[PDB]
């Protein structure tokens, strides 16, 4: 995965963006892990698509890579848990608590217990530290701000947050150059095979 | 698109496959609609990932484009329904029957009533036409045999099932050719970027 | 022990009703099977307590005793099913459909398929025959009017729908009579006297 | 002296028992509150009929009457909760915890937190205090032994656990007496006559 190879991906990213292949752009972002699209991450957070959010994140970091990463996954999963409590889906809330939040219990036993106990409140805002929680829309925006600091501060996201300035259609431009080089033999088609000039 | 632009997408598909960016490959297949990957389709069907199956499918066709597509979406949704019955999740079975299969009742009302009536059997295999139904993996495979024919017969799919023959790393090959072009005129020479054209150091 | 035994149960019913042991009254009605309380039945139906409704009915009749009984159970279970559909509890609706309504498919196969099909409707009123249904309260009332006629027509309830006219506390009156006999039987009837227990006959000397 | 009534109720209990009207017997026990049937209570606990158990108990006591009662109800609802965890129905387990067990949190907040935390274990037997818990059948049996003790110590059940010893069919005998007091009052009866009803006194043909 050399620097030239990695730069080819950015060129592909640009090309995909120009053809309006949106999902492909973000899958490529995620699977290559070369560029974290902060703007895309925001949209998905506001939309509360938490599965997509974590899946995208996993292209860049794991929960225990460092404490910035672990604080990021925690805030996401905490918000997910609270939203379930707020719609009174207790069953889903319990599922989130065992499947997503337990990994954090080893690191703070008392915090996990306190999180667990919110299940038995009729409204979780009765808890002092959550008392100022607004509605769903309000909580996501607030948490999004905290997610950004964590990401921007995170060592693993350092040089992945700004897309290089490029001239439009750069990949296409490189392809024209390669086509001209096949005509270098100039005695006067396709991209799949080299052009063969008739002599 | 463009006729050459379209070939560039295939080169990108090949590049992505070699870098092992698998999900990207199939999203690109789906969003471009240029190549239907039958092998990928088979895995997702055996795996019963029905949302992914339909999502991938939607890059190539809509449910009511032609009767081959109709049959494809109907067989998938029927199997999904039977599986819900087989795991005794009747709420889920009814949900599927209303949300996924109801669109088909217009075209055959009696078929829809009969599928609905499977809800009240203690085992749907008591029904004659399902009497040879196996388990989940056998039903998926047998249904898969049927989906492949429908796809192969489907006008919207038949020129999309064969990937063009290529030497490995063709995009990379082209990129090196393009690097040879920028350095073509450079006497007095003396590792480069792809973002901007290279400038020859003068004497 | 036969006809008096049946009359003693009615006296217990009156005694229990006077002591306000209400659940006990209706358990006795149900288990003896001697008196069907239409009024209590109406309350349970209006309240939608279908498990109790069927439980109480089952003390008097079974689903296949005759066509009047079968039709009573069918209307009850039908209404019960529709209510599950109306609150969009689909699991419960299918469960009612499989456990309770399947017994009727034998006697009418096409009807059962049509009831099954209500599951795929966005609202059961899309079915022509159910289209004029009002709210749940209204549907229970309308159904109750028909059930009432079915019970009144059903031979198996003959003699079970009218409570005998009685003087209040008739069981108590009898016990005092039995106590007056326990003194007569006894020596020269010294008063008052205090009466000791009902468990054993009273002694004198 | 509603002292004889309380005895008439017992005669009816006996009469109902002899007629095999079983459900009627226990409703009378429950609604009168005069006799707590421990044998029946045991059967309902072993079968896990928890709604019937609480429904029956409630004829004799409420959850907050005294500390034995509150504890009886706590043991029942705890076991009910654990069984829900053991069948992996967590939606039900949380449901039991909020509706049934929360009333006890006031009195021991820390205990309630510990019980709540059982939700996040793979198995509640991982908890030190539950580690010797067997299956549903043994657990009910163990807890039943404790419930029997608690009921026996509870002042509200004090004079209610022993059925008076009676001659069989006592109510019938009394009715026959109420009947012998009938053909007597006139009197011209040679054969004991056909007795008409219990609903009205018999008529003496003078």
From Swiss-Prot, chain B:
Effect of mutating residue 104 to A: Loss of interaction with EAR motif-containing full-length proteins
Tissues and organs where the protein is expressed, per its UniProt entry: Expressed in panicles, stems, leaves, spikelets and seed endosperm.
Ranges of residues in domain LisH: 4-36
Residue stretches making up the CTLH domain: 34-92
Domain of life (superkingdom): Eukaryota
Outcome of swapping residue 111 to A: Loss of interaction with EAR motif-containing full-length proteins
Result when mutating residue 150 to A: Loss of interaction with EAR motif-containing full-length proteins
Assembly, per entry: Tetramer. Interacts with D53. Interacts with WOX1. Interacts with MOF1.
Domain notes: The N-terminal TOPLESS domain (TPD)(1-209) binds directly to a 12-amino acid LxLxL EAR motif peptide, but no binding if the leucin residues are replaced.
Function of the protein: Probable downstream regulator of strigolactones signaling.
Protein name per Swiss-Prot or TrEMBL: Protein TPR1
From-to range in the entire protein, with total length: 1 to 207 of 1129
């Amino acid at each position: 995965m050399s620097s030239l190879s990695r730069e080819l991906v950015f060129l592909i990213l640009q090309f995909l963006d120009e053809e309006k292949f949106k999902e492909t752009v973000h899958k490529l972002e995620q699977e290559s892990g070369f560029f974290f699209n902060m703007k895309y991450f925001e949209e998905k957070v506001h939309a509360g698509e938490w599965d997509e959010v974590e899946k995208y994140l996993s292209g860049f970091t794991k929960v225990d890579d460092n404490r910035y990463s672990m604080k990021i996954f925690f805030e996401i999963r905490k918000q997910k848990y609270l939203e379930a409590l707020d719609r009174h889906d207790r069953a889903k809330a319990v599922d989130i608590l065992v499947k997503d939040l337990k990994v954090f219990s080893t690191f703070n036993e008392e915090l996990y217990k306190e999180i667990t106990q919110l299940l038995t409140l009729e409204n979780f805002r009765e808890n002092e530290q959550l008392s100022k929680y607004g509605d769903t829309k309000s909580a996501r925006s607030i948490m999004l701000i905290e997610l950004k600091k964590l990401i921007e501060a995170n060592p693993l996201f350092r040089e992945k947050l700004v897309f290089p300035t490029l001239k439009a259609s750069r990949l296409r431009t490189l392809i024209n150059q390669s086509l001209n080089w096949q005509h270098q033999l100039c005695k006067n088609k396709t991209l799949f095979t080299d052009h063969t000039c008739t002599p």
